Design an enzyme around this catalytic site. Sequence first.
Site, mmCIF file in Angstrom:
data_model
loop_
_atom_site.group_PDB
_atom_site.id
_atom_site.type_symbol
_atom_site.label_atom_id
_atom_site.label_comp_id
_atom_site.label_asym_id
_atom_site.label_seq_id
_atom_site.Cartn_x
_atom_site.Cartn_y
_atom_site.Cartn_z
ATOM 1 C CG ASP A 162 -1.683 1.292 1.375
ATOM 2 O OD1 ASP A 162 -2.580 1.563 0.551
ATOM 3 O OD2 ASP A 162 -1.382 2.042 2.328
ATOM 4 C CG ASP A 173 -1.264 5.521 2.389
ATOM 5 O OD1 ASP A 173 -2.511 5.522 2.322
ATOM 6 O OD2 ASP A 173 -0.619 4.653 3.011
ATOM 7 C CG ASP A 176 -5.129 4.509 0.005
ATOM 8 O OD1 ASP A 176 -6.206 4.492 -0.628
ATOM 9 O OD2 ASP A 176 -5.068 4.611 1.247
#
Length: 348
Positions: free
Chosen positions: A67, A69, A119
């Site tokens: 992930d 961000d 993300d």
Amino acid sequence: LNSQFNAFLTNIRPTDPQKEDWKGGAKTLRERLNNYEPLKDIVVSTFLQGSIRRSTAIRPLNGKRPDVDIVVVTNLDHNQIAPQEAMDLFVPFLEKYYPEKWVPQGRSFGITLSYVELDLVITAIPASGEEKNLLEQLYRSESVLTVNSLEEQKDWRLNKSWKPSESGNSANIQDAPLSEWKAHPLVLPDRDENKWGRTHPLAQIRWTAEKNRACNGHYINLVRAVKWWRQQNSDNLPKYPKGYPLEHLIGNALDDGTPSMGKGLVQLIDTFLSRWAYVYSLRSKPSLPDHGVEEHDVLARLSAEDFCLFYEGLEDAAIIARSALASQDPKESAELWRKLFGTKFPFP
Ligand SMILES: Nc1nc2c(ncn2[C@@H]2O[C@H](COP(=O)(O)OP(=O)(O)OP(=O)(O)O)[C@@H](O)[C@H]2O)c(=O)[nH]1
Ligand SMILES: Nc1nc2c(ncn2[C@@H]2O[C@H](COP(=O)(O)OP(=O)(O)OP(=O)(O)O)[C@@H](O)[C@H]2O)c(=O)[nH]1
Ligand SMILES: [Mg+2]
Ligand SMILES: [Mg+2]
Ligand SMILES: [Mg+2]
């Protein structure tokens, strides 16, 4: 020596193909948003945040994309447009450049890349007028727009004039005085509602950068180590705290002037047990303020039983860790750590 922790950390960090994918992806996303004509008037900045940016992300198991961000900073007046209507402005952009590969994830947009999962949170600047203009100068700076991680830029400073060293002065430029940014966080969507919340990613990055230097580069690597333990004993541990709540609890427990990984771990573990003994006996949880938005409790969503189950887990890990740091048998010491960290922690 301490080299066993270096090999283990290179085994738990995100891989170089993931590293190259999130750097080019964020760079490609930044150029697209800036050039895109229906968004050529709104996008102020696109930068990397999160554990990827702060070097506190461990590689996922089973080859799942880590992930990554990303923040899109806009110049929208957050008092005249709700986050859903602000995220709706980026729907056409997403259809054109990232078709059949994006998905609205409520509070954020998800972009599936080859090796990583972006993300994206759409954010706005609370300030206005000439006060807003000075903050946009910070979000368009090399301090914020860098795609390198904290482990690669240990000299990172939060300053609109700071430039990274060329490994050979703008590099000597220190952090901007708190009066310019500390009380001026960004706003993002609520996790569940159509209301703007407050986040300060840059402040979290600056606290992590300072805490890393004060612990001789061991801080970010100890966060990776504990996150790895939490993943390898996940069946004996409760589902929370994980992620940034867990990372924040490590930055609180770990003390300044950390000499080694071996001495860094038991220290932060012992301090977690001493500091939260009075809170754990009452079957309660601590209330730690966020490094970004000081009026926010990072552990607001952590259940009190959840934390006390985690306190019990750390006590089980503490027995192994103290044995391994005090054991002078290399056959027993390196074996002891692997009970805590799994196979990725290597032998001498
Ligand atoms: N203050 C505060 N910030 C948070 C909290 N949760 C997430 N954030 C911020 O949002 C960023 C991204 O959120 P997540 O991706 O869910 O957390 P993460 O630890 O980065 O996730 P992974 O590292 O990929 O496991 C974090 O780096 C934090 O800066 C929170 O509970 N409190
Ligand atoms: N930049 C960034 N900040 C985040 C992210 N996720 C969480 N945060 C910050 O961390 C805080 C806690 O996030 P949540 O646990 O989802 O809280 P929430 O449900 O969104 O809102 P409240 O519980 O009312 O505070 C938020 O107020 C954000 O400021 C993220 O993905 N990116
Ligand atoms: Mg993340
Ligand atoms: Mg995320
Ligand atoms: Mg909420």
